Amino acid sequence: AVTQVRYVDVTTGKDIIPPKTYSGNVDQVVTIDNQQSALTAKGYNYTSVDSSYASTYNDTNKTVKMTNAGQSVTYYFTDVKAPTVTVGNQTIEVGKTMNPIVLTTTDNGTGTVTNTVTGLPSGLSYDSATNSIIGTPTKIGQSTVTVVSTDQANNKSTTTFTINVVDTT
Ligand SMILES: [Ca+2]
């Protein structure tokens, strides 16, 4: 007379919040919580329910009827929020090996995040292993750098910043 509930990230199969068990007497109708409000705050939309292994489940009422045999209900959620790359404009001196520019990136989900960096000044390159721009700029001038960030669910954001390469004379 138990029912195991999971709240699952459809992209990765991971628990977004801890699984919850419900119990009752045999035949007792028990209300289960799909946690939609909490998951919305986490940047997820409620997407589907799998009750293949809980035949007593009523989706309209969000109930199970407890039986001698265990039951399982899985609620699935989709990450609908793009990653956040927080980067500002940067000045660097021509012809000097730069302190790397770290492209600070976070996300609400449970999977990978991949950045795509373009428009770098001559001498600069994106080190994807350290998620940082590295190099020695070769030429005075300003460049607009574009960073596209994509999470594993394929939500995308785009940010830009300028790199200004300056000389002392
Ligand atoms: Ca996300």
Author numbering: 495 to 663
Any passages from the paper?
S. aureus encodes a 2,271-residue SRRP termed serine-rich adhesin for binding to platelets (SraP), that is involved in the pathogenesis of infective endocarditis. S. aureus SraP, a surface-exposed serine-rich repeat glycoprotein (SRRP), is required for the pathogenesis of human infective endocarditis via its ligand-binding region (BR) adhering to human platelets. We determine the 2.05 Å crystal structure of SraPBR, revealing a rod-like tandem organization of four discrete modules: a legume lectin-like module, a module with a β-grasp fold, and two tandem cadherin-like modules that create the rigid stem of SraPBR. Further structural and biochemical analyses reveal that the legume lectin-like module specifically binds to N-acetylneuraminic acid (Neu5Ac), which may mediate adhesion to host sialylated receptors.
To further investigate the plasticity of these junctions, we determined three crystal structures for each of two consecutive modules: L-lectin&β-GF (Phe245–Lys575), β-GF&CDHL-1 (Ser494–Thr663), and CDHL-1&2 (Ala576–Asn751). We superimposed each of these three structures over the corresponding two modules of the full-length SraPBR structure, always with the C-terminal modules aligned. The results revealed slight twisting and/or translation with intermodule angle changes of 9.4°, 11.7° and 14.6° for the three junctions, respectively. In detail, residues Val496-Gln498 in L-lectin&β-GF, Phe571&Thr572 in β-GF&CDHL-1, and Asp661-Thr663 in CDHL-1&2 undergo slight conformational changes. The second module possesses a ubiquitin-like β-grasp fold (β-GF) in the immunoglobulin (Ig)-binding protein superfamily. The module contains a twisted four-stranded mixed β-sheet (β19-β18-β23-β21) packed against a two-stranded antiparallel β-sheet (β20–β22) and an α-helix α3. The second interface is formed by residues from β-GF and CDHL-1 via hydrogen bonds of Lys536-Asn602, Gly537-Asn602 and Asp503-Thr604. Ca-2 is fixed by Asp573 and Asp601 (bidentate coordination from Oδ1 and Oδ2), Asn602 (Oδ1), Asp645 (Oδ2), and the main-chain oxygen atom of Lys575, whereas Ca-3 is coordinated to Asp661 and Asp690 (bidentate coordination from Oδ1 and Oδ2), Asn691 (Oδ1), Asp734 (Oδ2), and the main-chain oxygen atom of Thr663. We thus propose that the β-GF module, in addition to the two CDHL modules, functions as a relatively rigid stem to project the L-lectin module outwards.
